[PDB]
Amino acid sequence: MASMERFLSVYDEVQAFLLDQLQSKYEIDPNRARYLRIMMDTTCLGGKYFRGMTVVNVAEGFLAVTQHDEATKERILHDACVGGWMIEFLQAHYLVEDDIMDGSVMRRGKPCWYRFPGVTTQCAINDGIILKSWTQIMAWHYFADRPFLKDLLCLFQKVDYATAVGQMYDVTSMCDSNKLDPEVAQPMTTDFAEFTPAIYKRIVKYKTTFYTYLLPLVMGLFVSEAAASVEMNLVERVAHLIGEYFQVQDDVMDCFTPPEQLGKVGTDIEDAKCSWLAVTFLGKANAAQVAEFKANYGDKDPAKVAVVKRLYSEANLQADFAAYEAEVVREVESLIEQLKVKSPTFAESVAVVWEKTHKRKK
Amino acid sequence: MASMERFLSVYDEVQAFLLDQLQSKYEIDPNRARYLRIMMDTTCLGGKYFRGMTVVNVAEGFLAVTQHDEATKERILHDACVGGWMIEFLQAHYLVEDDIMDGSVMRRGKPCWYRFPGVTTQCAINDGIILKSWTQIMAWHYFADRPFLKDLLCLFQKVDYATAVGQMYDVTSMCDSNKLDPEVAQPMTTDFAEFTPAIYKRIVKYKTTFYTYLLPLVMGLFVSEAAASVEMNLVERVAHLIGEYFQVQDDVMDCFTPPEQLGKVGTDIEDAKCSWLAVTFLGKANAAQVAEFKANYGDKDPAKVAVVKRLYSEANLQADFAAYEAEVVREVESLIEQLKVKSPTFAESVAVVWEKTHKRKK
Ligand SMILES: O=P(O)(O)C(O)(Cc1cccnc1)P(=O)(O)O
Ligand SMILES: O=P(O)(O)C(O)(Cc1cccnc1)P(=O)(O)O
Ligand code: DMA
Ligand code: DMA
Ligand SMILES: [Mg+2]
Ligand SMILES: [Mg+2]
Ligand SMILES: [Mg+2]
Ligand SMILES: [Mg+2]
Ligand SMILES: [Mg+2]
Ligand SMILES: [Mg+2]
């Protein structure tokens, strides 16, 4: 659409500013410049731009109802795009490191960045680090004189930290808590006692929901100078609820959506993740099903993986997904209605974000 | 000494604040809290605290000559300590990721963090990420109302980025530039044409000197509200020059200092690094020596490593080190003399920092 081509045009400006800076200030050679250019394209582009386009949507909502000079309108949209790219690049940073940590093979229908032959884990770790640093270069350069600069940096820091904390909860979600010990190699849980909805909710709240929904929605408010015009407690509740749903969808897709469609190859069963499928299965299985799950979960062996998928299909988790979805539809609509008391415009943005999320097939 | 025990006491406060926050705001369980506690201790403690104690030194320099209430003095010292810990933790972040990228085995006389049995590359990548995030939590929490907060965040961002850029220059310093290509597995240089003093200087300037010398010296100025009282161009020159010397020392030590003393196990020859030894050797070798260097460099094979060390010993690089050191002594003293025109107190801090650096055996 544009909107999205216009958003991508701002990516072009940001890439040129970043790479011209590397040549002019960081003594970079043209071949390392080209490597960082392809790195940025491979890691930042080719997705749906949900996060970045969410900040644009929120900004456009307020521009429709607020009086501004034309030049001001132009500035607000451009700030929305740059703010949207900071999040897309923060996401890029997490996905590069996540793919290494998850042992994944494909991202956005291409090899994970670390699996590019001329990349490898060694470089990719540091390239993911660079992606996050570029987010701060963008912010300091583009928003230097903006009133919202300090609030934005502080919120960005907290979202980032929550995400890294969340990634720790995730990567250790298959170990017994009482057995974590840097000194002792971590064995997988045999009881699965920590595969509960509460624990699942905590992992997901931190690892995903701050950056996929909370940050973009509040960033759209910041660039609009409209933050004080919403109830922040409601923004957070609805972010965390739509975020959790987004991650539940991701978990279902990891197992059940063909890689040609999804653009990734699922690893949750083999990595022994505390996914929504595993928790929900365990929430309804009889003693024999639990037993068979335990004998097959968290192994690379394709025959073992197939048994778990069979257990999932037989357990009729599509009923559970339907009942979970219907509950979230209830809760999201209820939050949108509460948002409209102070912010009809922001509520409608949340409605659109919800609608796009709910219908994605990724 | 104290000074350093007092500095470590501030580490205790910062750790407690961070871990109490994780329990109170991030829903952490006591066993993950304990893992992050040992992670922070293993990665942040046990070194010499040169960086952190440099900010304390600079602050103490100004307190001696400036009138302040007692309570103000106390606040400035505490800010110097917290600012010193931000750098120590930024360093901790780089060393955790660097040890993975370098395939190193020992750090501060213990296993590299990623080699702890109960850690592994998978966790350690994300733990290094957390270490840097904690630097921003510290800053926002402790310096929230300080006049220097914005300058400090902006300088911290730029030092960090320069370091990550520098780490890219380092990790790729053994590939031919014209052959870098994410699509093609990177072969080692056979001509060594990019092992030059200019290229060496650029790698070292970015990967090391911003965070080891520039940041702590300017941080001491920031917490002292004294930045405007020095010539920033001189601070940068002297930082970058003492930083380069510090890294040359590190390179010499990697090959020639026994691991029991150094607290690390050298990998530069096996990793094919553009070290000061390799560049300097190539700066004086005859055609046969160059030939033999090329037949042995950048291989894990202990017999090959021993040949390179033999070539280094025979090449009398201790003459070259002596001539390089004598030159830097000249240049550093000259910079200190220039610093004294506006800043006798800061010049004396630089003199102490230089003296401590020059005499280290690490
Ligand atoms: O894209 P992925 O790998 O399916 C995922 O959503 C990626 C991701 C990375 C970081 C935080 N949240 C989600 P995950 O949790 O790994 O299943
Ligand atoms: O401690 P190391 O590994 O000797 C080193 O100094 C560590 C280091 C990490 C990051 C930036 N600068 C130096 P290196 O460059 O790897 O030789
Ligand atoms: C797994 C994850 C963090 C997905 C974000 O979705 P997107 O619609 O913006 O497309 P992409 O996922 O490829 O960024
Ligand atoms: C290699 C490197 C970045 C060293 C810093 O020196 P330090 O004196 O402060 O002790 P440690 O090196 O262990 O931090
Ligand atoms: Mg993943
Ligand atoms: Mg993951
Ligand atoms: Mg997934
Ligand atoms: Mg190293
Ligand atoms: Mg290194
Ligand atoms: Mg070294």
Tab-separated table of N, CA, C and O in Angstrom, chain A residues 93 96-97 124-134, chain B residues 93-94 97 129 132 160 164:
chain	number	residue	atom	x	y	z
A	93	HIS	N	17.230	-6.749	16.107
A	93	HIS	CA	18.223	-7.088	17.054
A	93	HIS	C	17.776	-8.329	17.806
A	93	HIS	O	18.571	-9.279	17.933
A	96	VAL	N	17.676	-11.583	15.480
A	96	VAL	CA	19.021	-12.099	15.136
A	96	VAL	C	19.552	-12.956	16.320
A	96	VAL	O	20.093	-14.106	16.114
A	97	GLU	N	19.494	-12.410	17.539
A	97	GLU	CA	20.042	-13.180	18.691
A	97	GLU	C	19.156	-14.359	19.040
A	97	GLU	O	19.665	-15.419	19.394
A	124	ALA	N	27.320	-12.614	13.717
A	124	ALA	CA	25.953	-12.280	13.805
A	124	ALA	C	25.680	-11.762	15.239
A	124	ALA	O	24.813	-10.950	15.459
A	125	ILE	N	26.420	-12.255	16.223
A	125	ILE	CA	26.149	-11.803	17.601
A	125	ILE	C	26.360	-10.297	17.646
A	125	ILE	O	25.528	-9.550	18.156
A	126	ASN	N	27.502	-9.876	17.116
A	126	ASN	CA	27.886	-8.472	17.084
A	126	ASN	C	27.032	-7.652	16.122
A	126	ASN	O	26.625	-6.523	16.419
A	127	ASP	N	26.668	-8.231	14.978
A	127	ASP	CA	25.698	-7.534	14.109
A	127	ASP	C	24.369	-7.268	14.832
A	127	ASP	O	23.796	-6.220	14.706
A	128	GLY	N	23.841	-8.234	15.563
A	128	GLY	CA	22.602	-7.932	16.371
A	128	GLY	C	22.789	-6.797	17.370
A	128	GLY	O	21.921	-5.907	17.529
A	129	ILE	N	23.939	-6.779	18.004
A	129	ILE	CA	24.314	-5.655	18.865
A	129	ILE	C	24.335	-4.293	18.156
A	129	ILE	O	23.792	-3.248	18.658
A	130	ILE	N	24.933	-4.288	16.969
A	130	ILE	CA	24.886	-3.062	16.126
A	130	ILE	C	23.471	-2.624	15.795
A	130	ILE	O	23.145	-1.429	15.845
A	131	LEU	N	22.600	-3.585	15.463
A	131	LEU	CA	21.205	-3.191	15.139
A	131	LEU	C	20.555	-2.380	16.275
A	131	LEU	O	19.813	-1.393	16.026
A	132	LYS	N	20.759	-2.826	17.508
A	132	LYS	CA	20.168	-2.059	18.644
A	132	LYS	C	20.851	-0.716	18.816
A	132	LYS	O	20.214	0.316	19.081
A	133	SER	N	22.170	-0.690	18.693
A	133	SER	CA	22.835	0.603	18.757
A	133	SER	C	22.341	1.603	17.723
A	133	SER	O	22.203	2.796	18.002
A	134	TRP	N	22.081	1.149	16.504
A	134	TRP	CA	21.548	2.066	15.513
A	134	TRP	C	20.254	2.667	15.947
A	134	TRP	O	19.923	3.757	15.466
B	93	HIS	N	29.680	-6.541	29.435
B	93	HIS	CA	28.887	-6.867	28.312
B	93	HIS	C	29.805	-7.187	27.145
B	93	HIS	O	29.609	-8.227	26.489
B	94	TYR	N	30.728	-6.278	26.803
B	94	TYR	CA	31.625	-6.573	25.641
B	94	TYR	C	32.481	-7.832	25.833
B	94	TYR	O	32.707	-8.598	24.879
B	97	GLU	N	30.508	-11.148	25.275
B	97	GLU	CA	30.287	-11.460	23.835
B	97	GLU	C	31.598	-11.692	23.112
B	97	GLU	O	31.670	-12.560	22.244
B	129	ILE	N	23.773	-9.174	26.831
B	129	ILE	CA	22.755	-8.163	26.537
B	129	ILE	C	22.129	-7.515	27.780
B	129	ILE	O	21.975	-6.250	27.893
B	132	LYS	N	24.473	-4.897	29.514
B	132	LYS	CA	24.418	-3.517	28.949
B	132	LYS	C	23.121	-2.823	29.318
B	132	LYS	O	23.087	-1.626	29.645
B	160	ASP	N	29.509	3.267	23.044
B	160	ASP	CA	29.032	1.941	22.781
B	160	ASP	C	29.035	1.633	21.310
B	160	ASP	O	29.490	0.574	20.897
B	164	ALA	N	31.141	-1.318	19.221
B	164	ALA	CA	30.565	-2.405	18.391
B	164	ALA	C	31.078	-2.377	16.953
B	164	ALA	O	31.314	-3.428	16.328
